[PDB]
Amino acid sequence: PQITLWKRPLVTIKIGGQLKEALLDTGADDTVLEEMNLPGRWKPKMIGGVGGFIKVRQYDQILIEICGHKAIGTVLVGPTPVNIIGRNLLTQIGCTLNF
Amino acid sequence: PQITLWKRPLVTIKIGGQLKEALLDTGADDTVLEEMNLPGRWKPKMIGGVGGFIKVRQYDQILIEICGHKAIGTVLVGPTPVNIIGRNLLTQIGCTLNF
Numbered sequence A, B: 001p002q003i004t005l006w007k008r009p010l011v012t013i014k015i016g017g018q019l020k021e022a023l024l025d026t027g028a029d030d031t032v033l034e035e036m037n038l039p040g041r042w043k044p045k046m047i048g049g050v051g052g053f054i055k056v057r058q059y060d061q062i063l064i065e066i067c068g069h070k071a072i073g074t075v076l077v078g079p080t081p082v083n084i085i086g087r088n089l090l091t092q093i094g095c096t097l098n099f
């Protein structure tokens, strides 16, 4: 599909057997999701943006379905104000910017 | 053009007669640029990102050219980690997400 940018590009995602709303974010290197209890091992990480840094938990090879498009890769989990789908998964669903 | 997301979507912008590099950021409501001298009045504002809130100078009705496409809109100037082009300007240049 084509998504205009009049409003936040929020879409439904499926991760760990749960449906969530997440931002399709070309400005995010990696996907970061609001705090959630994912099983498995993880590695601590810090990501920086407007306002400074937050501490997140990096999970690898996590399966996410974005608008029926399946993807698998790194998913960060931490105190983000919004669920964010980053370029690491946007490339996997064939997402492009167009103007 | 069509821009894939294997790398950061960085583009050259022109603002205040000066060239700069900026990130096309569909996850940003607003456009935030690093510290710079701009003409015209400005009002102090607050903006929040993943790590908290920062103080910025708000410039309205500023001409800014993004990859040869002209826009006139609000530009926030402050201690952002990187120049980000947000939806307020992405819409003006006719930018959409496609997959």
Ligand SMILES: CC(C)CN(C[C@@H](O)[C@H](Cc1ccccc1)NC(=O)O[C@H]1CO[C@H]2OCC[C@H]21)S(=O)(=O)c1ccc(N)cc1
Residues within 6 Å of the ligand: A025, A027, A028, A029, A030, A031, A032, A047, A048, A049, A050, A081, A082, A084, A086, B023, B025, B026, B027, B028, B029, B030, B031, B032, B047, B048, B049, B050, B051, B081, B082, B084, B086
């Ligand atoms: C600032 C960017 C270079 C990086 N950010 C992605 C960006 O799209 C955030 C993503 C974002 C969106 C909402 C809330 C927090 C973070 N948007 C943002 O900061 O925009 C601000 C200016 O316009 C306003 O609208 C949103 C917040 C303001 S980030 O959230 O900090 C980030 C950094 C690293 C990763 N792996 C994932 C995300």
